[PDB]
Design a protein around this ligand. Structure first.
Ligand SMILES: [K+]
Ligand SMILES: [K+]
Lengths: 412, 412
C-alpha cells in the first residue's frame, strides 16, 4: 500500500565532503585512495586507505561537542544533516517530528577512541577515562545525536551487519515507513576505522591490498592484478519518505525504493559464496515485483578481492541468468575503497544519483579484465556512461555471510 | 495478518546458565550480583557486577572455535543454541532453513578483546594482532556463527540500541516474520563488557552504583538509597515463529508477541525523560490493539538510578493513567544487574515465563520505597507472586534516548 521515495541525500567520503563533490569525482573516474596519513601505518602490510579529507565537523555542530565523539559519529551526523537539509524538512512549518525516526548503523563503531582510551589507561590508569568515552563510541548514538538535534521522536536505533550495514538500515527504514511506524526515516551507515587496530585487523586477515607503491590502482575490482580491498571511511545517508507525505509538501523526489532482499550464506565467516548473494538478489527482485531483465544497473559489492569479485559474478549469473550479460555493473569501491558499514550507505546514494542523472559511474583500474576467472560481464570499465536507468540495484555481501540487496526505481 | 509466537527460550546470565536455573533464582529473590572477579577493578569507583559464573562454552562449540571469539559472542551463541534446542527445530525433518533468520544484537560488543589486543600491540606492535581479532569482535558475528552452525539462510544481522538492543532485535524480527521475509527468527541480545574500559567507562559517567561494601543490595530499584545501576553481562534469546508454521508441527507455544513500540526522547543522551518512554508504551499498545487496563504485568527498565527510576514511574503514569496503580511492575535488574544490549533479551524471556507459569518475579532490595520521589506504584517488592498474567509488557529505555516496548500475550 504505502510507497517509499527518497527526498534527501547525504554523503561524506574519500571522493567528496558533499554529494555533489562525490558525484563529480566518481563521474570523472578520480580515485579517493591515497597513502594513510591518519596514523603511522608503516608496520601494517597495507598502508593505503580511502580517507575523508578537508572535512570540518565544526560546520555542522559545535567544536566542543564534536570533541567528545569518535569520527564515525562525525561522518554520520554530517551526512545526516546534509540529507535533512537537502530534503527541505528544516523549512516545513508544523512538521510532525513524532513521525520521524533515525536508523544509522556502523560495522565497527568507535575503534579509534577505544584504542586511544586504552593507551591512556595503560599509561595512567582507569581514571583517565573521559566521562564522554562511552557515549562517544556507542554505535547507536549517531541516531541519538540526530534525533536530539532535530527533535525527532520516531523509532531510532542502529544496525550492525559489517559490509551490509548501510543496506540493512535503509531497507529496514523503508519497512518501518510502509508498516506505518513512521512517515519519515533518516537512514544509512557510517564508518571510521582508519586506526592501528582497524587497518591492522583486516591486514591480519590478509584481506587488504598491499599495493602500497601504487595507491591509486590498489583497488581494482575484476582486474587480473587485484589483491584485497582498500579500507575506507565515511558515511552515506538517505531521507526516506512516504510518497503521499512527500507529494503533499512540494518535495523533490530522487527515486523510489521498491525492493529489499536479505539472505545468509551459512558457509564462511569472511568469504562470500555464490548461492547466498544470489538468494538476496532474487529475494529483492521478488519483493519489488520485477524481473532480472528490468534491471539496468548493478552497483556491485565489488571489493577487489580475488575470490570475492569472481564469486559475485557467478552469483549475478545465477540470479540474472542471461540478462547478466545485458545489464551494466560497476563497483564505485574502485574509487572510494570499501567503506564497510558505510558502504551500503554511500552506494545507495550513488545508485539513486545514477537513476536521477542518467549516468553510470565507472569501475576504474580495469587494465586487464579477469575473464579467465569468469569475470566477463560489462563492469563499465574505466569510463562513465550516459545511460537511461529505470531500475538500479545495489548489492552488499558482508562478513558473517550476511547479504543485502536494495532495489531502486525511477519515480514518475 | 500473520501471527508470531514464541516457541523457544534461551538464557545465560548472572542468575543462571540456563533458563530453568534463572527462572528459579529470580522467583526465589536471589541476587546474581557480587564483587568483580573478572579483572582488577580496584581503581574504579564501581567494583560490583552481575557476572556469568560456572559457564562452559565448550558445551556448545569446540574450544578451538571459542578461542577466536570474544565472550559476548559466547553468551549469544550459547543462548541461541538453547532456544533452538528448546523449540525442537533441530529435530524437524526437511526443515526449510532458507526461511530461518537470525537477529541478535549487542550494545558494545567485543570491548574486552579490543582492550587485550590493544595492549599486545602496545607491547609488541601490529604483528600481535590475531587473524581472528576482527571477526572475534564484530557484533553481527553472533548471527553469523549461528546461521553457519545451523545452516539458516534467511535474513541475518544485528542491531545496536544500547539498553534497548535486545528489545529492538525481537520486535524487528517479529516484523520480519509478519512481512513474510521469514517464518522463523532467532532473536535477542548479548553483552560482555565486564572489563576495564567497560566498567570504567560507565563509572566515568557516574552511572554505576558505588555500594562496593554491600554488593547484594547495590541494585535496588525505586529504593530510597539507590545510587546508579549495576553492570551485568550475558544473553537472552527467543525463537520467534509464524503461528501456522508452529501449529502445523507439534510446537510448544510459550506466548504470542502482539505488539512492538518504538520512540525517541530527543532530549538527553544518557538520561530518560517522561514523554519519550510514554510514547513507546502507548505505541506498543496501539500496535497490539490493547488498552492499558488489560496489562497485567510490566517488566520495567528499572536500572536503580535516582532519576531514571522516578522518571520511569512518571512515564508509566502518563501511558497507563489510573491503571499505573492497578498493574504490577517489577525490575529483575534488582537481581541480574543491567545487561545492557542483552537486557531486553533476558527480560523478554522473564516476561514470557511470567505469562507461561503465572508468576511475577520480585523487585528485591526495596527497604524504603521512594514514595517522596513519586515512586508509589506496586513494584512487587521483595517477594514473588502467583498471578494470572494474560498480557505483559517489557520496557527498555536506553542511552541515546531510544525506547522500545514489547507486548506479549497468552496464546490459546
Ligand atoms: K553496492
Ligand atoms: K524490561
Amino acid at each position: 500500500q504505502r510507497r517509499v521515495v527518497i527526498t534527501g541525500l547525504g554523503q561524506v567520503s574519500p571522493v567528496g565532503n558533499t554529494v555533489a563533490e562525490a558525484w563529480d569525482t566518481l563521474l570523472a573516474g578520480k580515485s579517493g585512495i591515497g597513502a594513510i596519513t591518519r596514523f603511522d601505518a608503516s608496520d601494517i602490510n597495507s598502508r593505503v586507505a580511502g580517507e575523508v579529507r578537508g572535512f570540518d565537523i565544526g560546520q555542522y555542530i559545535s567544536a566542543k561537542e564534536a570533541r567528545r565523539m569518535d569520527v564515525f559519529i562525525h561522518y554520520g551526523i554530517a551526512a545526516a544533516l546534509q540529507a535533512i537539509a537537502d530534503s527541505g524538512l528544516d523549512d516545513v512549518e508544523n512538521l510532525d517530528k513524532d513521525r520521524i525516526g533515525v536508523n544509522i548503523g556502523s560495522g565497527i563503531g568507535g575503534l579509534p577512541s577505544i584504542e586511544v582510551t586504552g593507551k591512556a589507561v595503560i599509561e595512567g590508569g582507569a581514571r583517565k577515562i573521559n566521562p564522554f568515552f562511552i557515549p562517544g563510541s556507542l554505535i547507536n548514538l549517531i541516531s541519538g545525536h540526530v534525533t536530539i538535534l532535530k527533535g525527532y521522536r520516531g523509532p531510532s536505533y542502529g544496525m550492525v551487519s559489517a559490509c551490509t550495514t548501510g543496506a540493512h538500515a535503509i531497507g529496514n527504514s523503508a519497512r518501518l515507513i510502509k508498516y506505518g511506524d513512521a512517515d519519515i526515516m533518516v537512514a544509512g551507515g557510517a564508518e571510521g576505522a582508519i586506526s592501528t587496530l582497524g587497518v591492522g585487523g583486516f591486514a591480519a586477515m590478509k584481506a587488504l591490498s598491499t599495493r602500497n607503491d601504487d595507491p591509486a590502482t590498489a583497488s581494482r575490482p575484476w582486474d587480473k592484478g587485484r589483491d584485497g580491498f582498500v579500507i575506507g571511511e565515511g558515511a552515506g545517508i538517505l531521507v526516506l519518505e512516504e510518497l503521499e507525505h512527500a507529494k503533499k509538501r512540494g518535495a523533490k523526489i530522487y527515486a523510489e525504493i521498491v525492493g529489499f532482499g536479505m539472505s545468509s550464506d551459512a558457509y564462511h565467516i569472511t568469504a562470500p559464496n555464490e548461492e547466498g548473494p544470489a538468494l538476496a538478489v532474487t529475494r529483492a527482485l521478488k519483493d519489488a515485483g520485477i524481473n532480472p531483465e528490468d534491471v539496468d544497473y548493478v552497483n556491485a559489492h565489488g571489493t577487489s578481492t580475488p575470490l570475492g569479485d569472481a564469486n559475485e559474478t557467478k552469483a549475478l549469473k545465477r540470479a540474472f541468468g542471461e540478462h547478466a550479460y545485458k545489464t551494466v555493473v560497476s563497483s564505485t569501491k574502485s574509487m572510494t575503497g570499501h567503506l564497510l558499514g558505510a558502504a551500503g550507505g554511500v552506494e545507495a546514494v550513488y545508485s539513486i544519483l545514477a537513476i536521477h542523472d542518467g549516468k553510470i559511474p565507472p569501475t576504474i583500474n580495469i587494465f586487464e579484465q579477469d575473464v579467465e576467472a569468469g569475470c566477463d560481464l560489462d563492469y563499465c570499465a574505466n569510463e562513465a556512461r550516459d545511460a537511461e536507468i529505470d531500475v538500479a540495484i545495489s548489492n552488499s555481501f558482508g562478513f558473517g555471510g550476511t547479504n543485502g540487496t536494495l532495489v531502486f526505481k525511477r519515480f514518475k
